[PDB]
A paper describes a structure:
Bovine and camel chymosin are aspartic peptidases that are used industrially in cheese production. They cleave the Phe105-Met106 bond of the milk protein κ-casein, releasing its predominantly negatively charged C-terminus, which leads to the separation of the milk into curds and whey. Despite having 85% sequence identity, camel chymosin shows a 70% higher milk-clotting activity than bovine chymosin towards bovine milk. The substrate-binding cleft and active site are located at the interface of the two domains.
The doubly glycosylated variant 2 was used for the crystallization of camel chymosin. The crystals obtained by crystallization of variant 2 contained a protein lacking the first three residues of the N-terminus. The structural model of camel chymosin contains an NAG residue covalently bound to Asn100 and this does not appear to influence the atomic displacement parameters, which are similar to the values for bovine chymosin. The higher mobility of the loop containing Asn291 could explain why it was not possible to identify any carbohydrate bound to Asn291 in the electron density, even though mass spectrometry of the crystals had shown that camel chymosin was glycosylated at both sites. The first ten residues are not visible in camel chymosin. The disordered N-terminus of camel chymosin implies that this structure lacks one of the strands, which leads to a breakdown of the pseudo-twofold symmetry that relates the two domains of the chymosin structure. The presence of the large charged Arg5 and Glu6 residues (Ser5 and Val6 in bovine chymosin) adjacent to each other precludes the participation of the N-terminus in the β-­sheet, as one of them must be buried in the hydrophobic core of the protein. In camel chymosin it blocks a major part of the binding cleft and must undergo a conformational change upon binding of substrate. The lack of hydrogen-bond partners for the β-strand formed by residues Leu166–Leu168 is compensated in camel chymosin by a slight displacement of the loop formed by residues 93–96, which enables the side chain of Ser94 to form a hydrogen bond to the carbonyl group of Leu166, thus connecting the β-strand to the loop 93–96. In addition, camel chymosin possesses a small positive patch on the C-terminal domain comprised of residues Arg242, Arg254 and Lys278 (part of the second patch); the corresponding residues in the bovine enzyme are hydrophilic but neutral.
Numbering used by the authors: 11 to 323
Amino acid sequence: YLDSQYFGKIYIGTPPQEFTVVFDTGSSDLWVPSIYCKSNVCKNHHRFDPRKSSTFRNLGKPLSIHYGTGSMEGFLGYDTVTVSNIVDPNQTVGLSTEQPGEVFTYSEFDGILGLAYPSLASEYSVPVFDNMMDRHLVARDLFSVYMDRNGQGSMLTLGAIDPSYYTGSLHWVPVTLQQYWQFTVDSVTINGVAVACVGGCQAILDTGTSVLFGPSSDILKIQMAIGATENRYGEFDVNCGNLRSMPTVVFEINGRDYPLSPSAYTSKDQGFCTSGFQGDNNSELWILGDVFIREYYSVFDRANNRVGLAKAI
Ligand SMILES: *[C@@H]1O[C@H](CO)[C@@H](O)[C@H](O)[C@H]1NC(C)=O
């Protein structure tokens, strides 16, 4: 759930040391590799050296996070972190000392900056946006996410909504459980009939994920409804020539329709077209990743515990 290209540069310490991080609405901790991680993966990424920062303070607290295909262990420090033109002082930063796992081998980011609720933060870790809200460094207690449909995009706006990135009106959906950015999806219909999320379901908006995940049974119904066929890689593909005649998949959220066109829910790479839906056999949680967010400019409002959606430019 960390394969999206929703990265950004951040700066930590005095003078600033630069890192690339995935901005992840599916988690809540900030961490980057430290100079004390000596593995190949770490040595060939940016590593924070606390000895070189005059504002660094060691918290005397550990951090350990497990991922599907890896884990990180490290230590926590305070330092100044700059993100999207906001300078965030006295910010807890996780600093890796080990990073086993394929996830880090195959990911271009140095670290992760979580944007979910503090309930998901590790012990002793304070989420970046929480620290910013607490210190009153943002104009409003919300942030906004634009992902450009074509090629690694594009913007994280902290403390504001940027109307230049959407058309039509912003519509709001209440958060149901304040951990992930979680809410109710009412239905998923295709060709005007119920296919998935029948009777409603729980979903999250997850900027860290490239695809759209759902329970396997429901997802298989979607693959069949869109005319996709399973291949030997375990993915589902379609004839690119059929995109013009394929159906829209409609996510209904708080009673309004959020259609995904065939071009939006498939990937086309040198004439090979694959479904952006992926099934999970061990979870009923729908994960609306970049497939969805590329189509819908997304506002994450902590003051009012709600998500705002509008059609992206
Ligand atoms: C903020 O950080 C400074 C050092 O940078 C420290 O002296 C101070 O105690 C911190 N403030 C709080 C409220 O933790």
